[PDB]
Write a protein that binds this ligand. Structure first.
Ligand SMILES: [F-]
Ligand SMILES: [F-]
Ligand SMILES: [F-]
Ligand SMILES: [F-]
Ligand SMILES: [Mg+2]
Ligand SMILES: [Mg+2]
Ligand SMILES: [Mg+2]
Ligand SMILES: [Mg+2]
Lengths: 432, 435
């Protein structure tokens, strides 16, 4: 059973409050913290913020923390449920909140406990967290994912005109996870130089996820820069590119604005067809293997049409919000073929594992993901290995809310020893 | 005793390899990682890198890792010393390296083990790390420091012309550490908007330490931006400014280049006297209460002259490199009045504690500090509390290699409860504060 639960407000990687939970059992103290998105889809479970405009600019999480300390904690302690009972504990918190979208307590309240429970459960089972998660998920295997490093930041994560959010490199040809880290870092460092040589040092500062924030507008130019860095680093045969467009951020009036960080000008909007055509160009001209949120979270028609006309990975993020109900629709409409798995989009570990299992059962990839507001928490490193998904995006190899995860993946790889498997080229279908 | 030690290469906050050490005792696994500077003083202990130009652009630390795993580990295991014996264990490593600057094993090797030992030692004591550190240092009455948040980054930490490395805000007027975090974060967010409004969104990306990296040249303008943000956030009466000039980074031919990231042009260099005059203006025009490395690490006369002619805090960083030998000279020459305490400039916990104690015995302040290449390690949070120094600089409230420390300090404050005392306006001298 749980002895004590105590939540507090900490600061995330952008300097905004978030929830941290300390959970005590007879095995010790288990601590987890909750990330926070910037480009948050409208269907995400509620992130409860205090809205006191004088305090942390409205972004405190005192209410969430209080819901944990005043309500969730005593209920879960009094239940006497063992922390190995992840689903029962998670379901009890869902029932306690009583709302579909976790708007009574906040998904951030619930998730913080959920995560700490999971860590505590692992200890109760005398298992590393990744193995506990694997058992929760009904997995026998463990595989190290290909990391997708967001090395050029745009969209809502960077001060630049670049509309698409993330340009990532995936070292699919690395020999191991540790090697993939080296490949990603070398390319990242190379890219700093490619950017400085063309744009000057003012273009070499970083956005929220640690990728460079060059002063460019054209998304194709981001791809060019990444491709050039890959080449210059000597890894053209081993590194491919993924993008997160985050198109819901620039959807306007049924159309899309690829200059949305510039003052409003509807004549520059393009249709979903035009946007798709651009993607096709990117796929033809660059080693783009994966595009996330190519279209708005409600533009089902565009997702389905596009997915049916390409062979690349198409990742639902805001489309699916780690939510089995949305995933079912996406599966039925063949809207995408990969789920981005963000535990705080849904609000509990159990529901995130269910979402993953649902995707995988329907033949989708799953990419575990950070949020752009992260913490020093490294849960998602254990999560991706336990869920065997083959792919994780958790930042550039810059800013330690990113490296914390990457370093933890290296540690897990080391732990697995000669049993360590790296998904490599099978990142989309690592089950094989 | 120590049962096993195993070091690995991890990546730091800039994406460069660094040392992490796992140390096992019967109480479990204790893990620590070593930070890395960018603007590193010539007198810092050696950071051993592999120099394999093809791997991590020569920045691997496999050699350090191997020294730990194959040479230091058996030595410490063989010693049978308990992990509580920090000084004995550090001394064993120092003697085994046997070099002045830790150039056999690398300071990064020795420090990684030293830190892990310290954590293991705390557990052996069944003490929180900050309390173990306090005992190591001979302190009883612990203090939460004023945080110094580097909210505009320049110098070698940012892609801008701005030559001076760090512009910090210090919430001396805050009620508590948790409150200081709120003040600093609110100013930081406010500052983003001040910058965006004046210089555009392109100016609101961040540098290595999480501070904005606006496309400015003039250091006065960084101060103006910070002062404006403080005032707009409503905290003029509670937040002051500190700077890390890191002048050794732009010392050129006995003069100083405040546009050193622009193609060389000696006509623009200024003398140390001109530089000092500039600082005097800063101190008069802005609420600057602390300046670090105002002159080159070897420009002793400048330092003494300046310190003698100001009433603010002057912090040795590259001057002193957390090195009692250099500190002794600084004291004698009254070169500065505060030590920046960076464990990896000297390479062991014991030496860093000694350095701290030497400073404090001589009436100096001590500001515990990160490096610009940090990790998710939070050691220095416990260190600053345990050493009761009253001041820590460990980043903007942005990038979790920064926030991990600040968050840890909030947890420490919570753990100390009604025994929590915040240094506040006594950041230079917190011993005055009763318990
Ligand atoms: F996103
Ligand atoms: F995302
Ligand atoms: F420095
Ligand atoms: F520094
Ligand atoms: Mg988003
Ligand atoms: Mg996304
Ligand atoms: Mg420096
Ligand atoms: Mg310095």
């Amino acid at each position: 059973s749980i002895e004590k639960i105590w939540a507090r407000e900490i600061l995330d990687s952008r300097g905004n409050p978030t929830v941290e939970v300390d959970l005590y059992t007879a095995k010790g103290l288990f601590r987890a913290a909750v990330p926070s998105g910037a480009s948050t889809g409208i269907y995400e479970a509620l992130e409860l913020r205090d809205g006191d405009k004088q305090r942390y600019l409205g972004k405190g999480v005192l209410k969430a923390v209080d819901h944990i300390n005043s309500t969730i904690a005593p209920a879960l302690i009094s239940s006497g449920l063992s922390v190995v009972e992840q689903e029962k504990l998670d379901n009890l918190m869902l029932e306690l909140d009583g709302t579909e979208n976790k708007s009574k307590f906040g998904a951030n309240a619930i998730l913080g406990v959920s995560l700490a429970v999971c860590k505590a459960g692992a200890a109760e089972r005398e298992l590393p967290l990744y193995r506990h998660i694997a058992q929760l998920a009904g997995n026998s295997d463990l595989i190290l994912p290909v990391p997708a490093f967001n090395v050029i930041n745009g969209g809502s994560h960077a001060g630049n005109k670049l509309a698409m959010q993330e340009f990532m490199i995936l070292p699919v040809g690395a020999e191991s996870f540790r090697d993939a880290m080296r490949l990603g870092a070398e390319v990242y460092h190379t890219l700093k130089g490619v950017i400085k040589d063309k744009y000057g040092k003012d273009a070499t500062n970083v956005g929220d996820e640690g990728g460079f924030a060059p002063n460019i507008l054209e998304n194709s130019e981001a791809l060019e820069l990444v491709k050039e860095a890959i080449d210059k680093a000597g890894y053209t045969e081993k590194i491919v590119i993924g993008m997160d467009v985050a198109a819901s951020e620039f959807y306007r009036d049924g159309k899309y604005d690829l200059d949305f960080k510039s003052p409003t000008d509807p004549s520059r909007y393009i249709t979903g067809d035009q946007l798709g055509a651009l993607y096709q160009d990117f796929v033809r001209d660059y080693p783009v293997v994966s595009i996330e949120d190519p279209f708005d979270q409600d533009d089902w028609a565009a997702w389905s049409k596009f997915t049916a006309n390409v062979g690349i990975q198409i990742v639902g993020d805001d489309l699916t919000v780690t939510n089995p109900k949305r995933i079912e629709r996406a599966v039925e409409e063949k809207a995408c073929n990969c789920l981005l798995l963000k535990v705080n989009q849904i609000g509990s570990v159990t529901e995130a594992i269910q979402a993953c299992k649902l995707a995988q059962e329907n033949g989708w990839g799953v990419m575990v993901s950070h949020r752009s507001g992260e913490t020093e928490d490294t849960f998602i490193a254990d999560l991706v290995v336990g869920l065997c998904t083959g792919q994780i995006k958790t930042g550039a190899p810059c800013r330690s809310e990113r490296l914390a995860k990457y370093n933890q993946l290296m540690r897990i790889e080391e732990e697995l020893g000669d049993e360590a498997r790296f998904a490599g080229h099978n990142f989309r279908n690592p089950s094989v």
